[PDB]
Ligand code: CHL
Ligand code: CHL
């Protein structure tokens with residue numbers, strides 16, 4: 023499965039007729055779901071796959087990155103701020119920004135120098151991803167190869183065509199979960215692990231319906 | 242009239258100087274307004290007609306259900322606070338959520354029961370709308386007929402091709418009026434009949450320009 | 461097409477040397493083609509035409525909007541007695557007791573009714589946007605977005621090289637304004653002040669009147 | 682206050698301007714003379730070239 | 738006296754701008770020499 | 773080379789003992805310049821001032 | 824094989840081998856003090872680090888020089904870690920990371936008994 027006609031699909035068994043023609047099943051993650059009809063052009067459908075995988079890979083680093091400064095707070099490690107969305111504002115703090123509870127670490131103080139180094143560093147590696155760089159030029163734009171896969175996992179192409187499906191399914195789970203983290207923090211105001219503890223405290227009373235009457239027009 | 246290359250259009254006399262060549266007149270509701278060029282692909286234009294028609298049907302169900310708890314409120318029907326954009330919070334009242342005013346009616350307190358019932362009902366029902374099933378399979382995805390035309394009205398193919406235009410024109414301003422009701426509740430904060438009562442009290446003074454300086458950013 | 465440095469395969473690109481090669485349908489014969497359609501919205505040549513009048517009219521409104529939002533605000537700081545000089549607080553001048561006096565001068569326009577302003581705006585903007593689509597007394601069969609003729613009175617779009625050069629200047633001055641007019645919206649929601657009042661404060665202390673002093677403004681609370 | 686004056690000699694105002702009409706006089710005359718020069722640049726030779734000055 | 742000060746600034750910056758935009762207008766090729 | 777040479781005077785006035793400040797209270801004295809006036813309207817006010 | 828790309832520009836690979844190898848290469852003195860006839864003939868531009876710097880004629884022929892390359896390269900690579908091994912714990916000792924013995928010469932005296 024996961025390729026060809028008898029792959030898994032987005033309505034399970036009730037999905038043999040909603041699948042369009044162009045979503046055949048030779049790409050990874052191809053469950054045949056274009057209800058909005060957006061990818062009827064293969065020159066355009068090639069471009070959204072470029073966007074989806076990169077959004078998938080930034081979200082997998084976004085999910086774990088928003089979690090580990092709060093799980094390590096549950097191990098008692100002092101951070102100055104452990105909540106993910108309040109984490110950026112502590113370069114304005116008096117001690118500044120230490121990488122853990124260690125003022126002998128990075129000890130950042132100036133926000134504008136931290137941003138300006140990012141524009142040069144991220145600006146040049148995102149340009150290498152497009153055209154080419156020190157780690158190779160004429161490669162696959164999404165699965166480039168050897169310097170980013172040192173461990174040789176991209177061999178035996180039946181495994182390699184299967185690890186891609188592991189990559190996108192883990193990835194689509196992350197983008198869905200990161201869209202969680204914004205909403206559950208813009209509504210509640212607390213962290214995700216903290217709001218997990220609020221639900222595991224009393225699940226019947228701690229749901230989104232406890233905040234359902236929040237955004238009402240008070241006029 | 243209503244079809245062919247002599248249908249009425251969305252600017253009238255000015256409209257004939259810019260109308261898209263891929264819009265011909267072979268579908269109901271063609272007034273030649275695709276200036277953004279979004280439906281130039283005939284495959285996507287197949288899908289956008291399906292997205293338009295379903296949105297219209299929930300709007301025609303929606304727009305009628307937003308005012309019937311308010312017209313009955315001025316005809317002496319005992320409701321518990323029947324205004325559509327805050328009637329969802331009636332389930333957290335202490336008497337459950339009785340339907341008209343009467344406790345021997347539905348009397349729903351646990352929203353977890355009525356939610357999970359809905360997603361199983363609407364899960365199979367929306368799944369059957371795409372693939373088919375117990376109310377026919379091999380039918381048109383927009384107008385199946387038969388089980389959904391019991392009253393025989395979808396005959397006389399010179400009349401059925403004109404009830405479509407009545408289906409979508411009545412459908413379009415219902416979509417335009419639910420986009421009405423949303424904004425007139427965000428800004429004002431009262432039911433649309435209460436807005437319509439207040440506009441008729443003084444149309445020169447009480448209109449939308451009284452609320453024009455509401456969202457000025459005080460900082 | 462001549463050697464004009466902006467049209468053709470040697471044209472400059474939106475990432476410089478790191479662009480590589482543009483998409484296969486952006487071949488460099490339309491103004492402002494730096495080859496940036498990474499999301500590929502306009503692969504259909506029927507659809508790609510539809511974004512260009514959609515871009516150019518947005519430019520020709522934003523360039524009026526960029527000058528129009530600051531020029532009463534600039535003169536307001538030099539003693540011209542406006543009702544309000546700030547662009548997003550100038551729409552509510554119809555509700556004050558003196559009416560909307562143009563230039564702050566009571567013997568000018570002196571508008572009173574907001575309905576009369578809007579009643580004659582639609583009856584005019586309907587006709588001239590109607591004339592822009594087709595017809596109209598100033599030209600019958602012309603281009604949809606470079607009509608010329610009575611819309612080029614000074615006659616400075618006649619040579620096919622100079623006119624192909626000034627189309628590049630129009631869209632780049634346009635794309636400068638649309639990006640900047642987007643900036644007026646965000647730094648008025650955030651800062652709450654007029655846009656030069658934001659400028660005269662950043663020139664006061666640049667280290668502390670930057671945008672990061674407003675970074676904790678929308679904290680969930 | 683037996684009379685009215687500029688009172689603006691020791692003030693050190695920039696370019697000597699004290700009324701903001703002077704800044705528009707300083708700038709508006711400048712832009713007009715620039716505008717006539719920029720239009721008439723078409724006659725002054727086109728040195729869009731590698732090296733085309735009064736060289737030696 | 739303000740009416741006089743706004744007039745001198747129009748006069749001076751007229752003639753100062755004929756100077757600056759005069760020497761820019763390819764003066765080093767306004768010579769009788771040949772090449 | 774004279775951009776960097778300007779900074780040597782800046783570094784010696786903020787880190788390396790400072791310079792002789794004759795407007796010190798109670799006679800002139802060496803003061804480390806801690807808060808240099810870097811306002812553009814203050815700095816460029818000297819250049820377009822009359823002589 | 825490795826079709827690569829330059830860091831800033833648009834072309835990778837070797838910048839210039841002729842800047843460092845062969846007859847024309849950087850030397851320990853410029854051209855005005857040291858011409859190409861004063862080069863010892865057992866130093867030709869075919870190894871790295873060949874600035875021709877050998878006033879004391881310790882090397883004789885490139886076979887003898889090659890075993891001193893073993894003494895040169897191995898003394899290099901153990902020293903390069905030592906410079907990081909000395910400076911890095913002392914700064915962490917300075918900022919607040921308690922090494923208790925980050926300073927390099929009295930490190931062993933901290934761990935005796
Ligand atoms: C046969 C049963 C079956 C059904 C009914 C579905 C249905 C669905 N699958 Mg599928 N699947 C099913 C079997 C299977 N799926 C999959 C694998 C997948 C994948 C990988 C994915 C899906 C997805 C989807 C969704 C696509 C449509 C959608 O996004 O709706 C969205 C719209 C609604 C659900 C309706 C609106 C929400 C809510 C119910 C309304 C309630 C309103 C709120 C209370 C308040 C409103 C807020 C206001 C106030 C502001 C849909 C929920 C996609 C998905 O997960 O999308 C997120 C998707 O990525 N399925 C497998 C494994 C092979 C199946 C095995 O049998
Ligand atoms: C001959 C004159 C004539 C004119 C001027 C129009 C114009 C229009 N028709 Mg058409 N029609 C005309 C003849 C006819 N129409 C139709 C049938 C239809 C239909 C079915 C539809 C239209 C629609 C439209 C609209 C589509 C263009 C648009 O989207 O505007 C976009 C531009 C504007 C709206 C400009 C804004 C004007 C206004 C002054 C804005 C006010 C600004 C705010 C006060 C401040 C801003 C708020 C900020 C704070 C966020 C437009 C209003 C469509 C529609 O209803 O869309 C809503 C539509 O569905 N027409 C028929 C029957 C055949 C006609 C007869 O000749």
Ligand code: CHL
Nearest residue numbers: 453454456457458548549550551552554577578645648649
């Ligand atoms: C051309 C577009 C247009 C825009 C962007 C605005 C915007 C505004 N008007 Mg205005 N108007 C516009 C046209 C017109 N207005 C008026 C008459 C008035 C009056 C009487 C008043 C305003 C007021 C306002 C301000 C509301 C304060 C605010 O939004 O908070 C800050 C937030 C922002 C500035 C962000 C706004 C950006 C915008 C939402 C996104 C831009 C895209 C729009 C959706 C496009 C809309 C065009 C459509 C209608 C075709 C706001 C600046 C009120 C005011 O003066 O405020 C004190 C007010 O009292 N307008 C007329 C005559 C009928 C117009 C003609 O078209």
Ligand code: CHL
Nearest residue numbers: 125126127128129130131132135136139910911914915918
């Ligand atoms: C402005 C105040 C400021 C100061 C005083 C420091 C100083 C420090 N930084 Mg930090 N940083 C500061 C802000 C910032 N840093 C960084 C990014 C980093 C990185 C990537 C690293 C540091 C490291 C360090 C620590 C050196 C550790 C060591 O023992 O030396 C060992 C190093 C040497 C012996 C050689 C370098 C000597 C010198 C200490 C330079 C290191 C400092 C920074 C690179 C920037 C220089 C700041 C100036 C004002 C002293 C030390 C606490 C290092 C660290 O985290 O080690 C635990 C390190 O790797 N900082 C950014 C983002 C650009 C900042 C902006 O606000």
Ligand SMILES: CCCCCCCCCCCCCCCCCC(=O)OC[C@H](CO[C@@H]1O[C@H](CO[C@H]2O[C@H](CO)[C@H](O)[C@H](O)[C@H]2O)[C@H](O)[C@H](O)[C@H]1O)OC(=O)CCCCCCCCCCCCCCCCC
Nearest residue numbers: 695696698704707708709711712713722723724725726727
């Ligand atoms: C208390 C405060 C008081 C403040 C007082 C104000 C003081 C201001 C001091 C400013 C001092 C600057 C003086 C030096 C300017 C030098 C300009 C120049 O050498 O200029 C040389 C260049 C030449 O430009 C080139 O000109 C070329 C000309 O080509 C033409 O000519 C070519 C051959 O000549 C070919 O023939 C070709 O076909 C043809 O098109 C092309 O156009 C090029 O694209 C173009 O880059 O000009 C340019 O880049 C000029 C770029 C800068 C322009 C600045 C304009 C500023 C305007 C401010 C607002 C004024 C408002 C005015 C309103 C008026 C109405 C009231």
Ligand code: CLA
Nearest residue numbers: 524525527528531532542544545550551562563564568569
């Ligand atoms: C996209 C374009 C745009 C838009 C929509 C606006 C919108 C607005 N501007 Mg702005 N503006 C813009 C561009 C724009 N501006 C630009 C580019 C400039 C620079 C020239 C200005 C300069 C400007 C000033 C200086 C002022 C405005 C003002 C206004 C407001 C009212 C406009 C008005 O009174 O019209 C009426 C104007 C006209 C109908 C045209 C001018 C007519 C004058 C009065 C001469 C009259 C002609 C003749 C002598 C009399 C007829 C004969 C008679 C005797 C019978 C409104 C918010 C006013 C305000 O309060 O904002 C803060 C204001 O004072 N605008």
Ligand code: CLA
Nearest residue numbers: 773774776777780849850851852853854855856857858859
């Ligand atoms: C204006 C300064 C200047 C310039 C442009 C040059 C340029 C040159 N020199 Mg000359 N030279 C200079 C000063 C200068 N020199 C001085 C001051 C001395 C006396 C030490 C010499 C002695 C000298 C000799 C003897 C020779 C050259 C040679 C050369 C050529 C380059 C080869 C080379 O690396 O230089 C060689 C010189 C050095 C590598 C000196 C080291 C330079 C240090 C590392 C730079 C320090 C810069 C620092 C910021 C300055 C401090 C600030 C302040 C004191 C100003 C080139 C034509 C060679 C040549 O032409 O070949 C025939 C050559 O044989 N130069």
Ligand SMILES: CC1=C[C@H](O)CC(C)(C)[C@H]1/C=C/C(C)=C/C=C/C(C)=C/C=C/C=C(C)/C=C/C=C(C)/C=C/C1=C(C)C[C@H](O)CC1(C)C
Nearest residue numbers: 055056057058059077080081084087088106109197200201
């Ligand atoms: C498919 C389809 C089909 C049909 O046809 C149509 C439709 C329906 C339309 C479609 C759908 C779609 C969708 C659903 C989408 C979504 C997406 C997403 C959500 C993404 C995210 C995405 C997301 C993402 C990236 C994210 C990322 C993140 C990150 C990095 C983070 C970072 C961070 C961290 C670490 C921490 C600190 O403290 C801070 C921060 C900074 C915060």
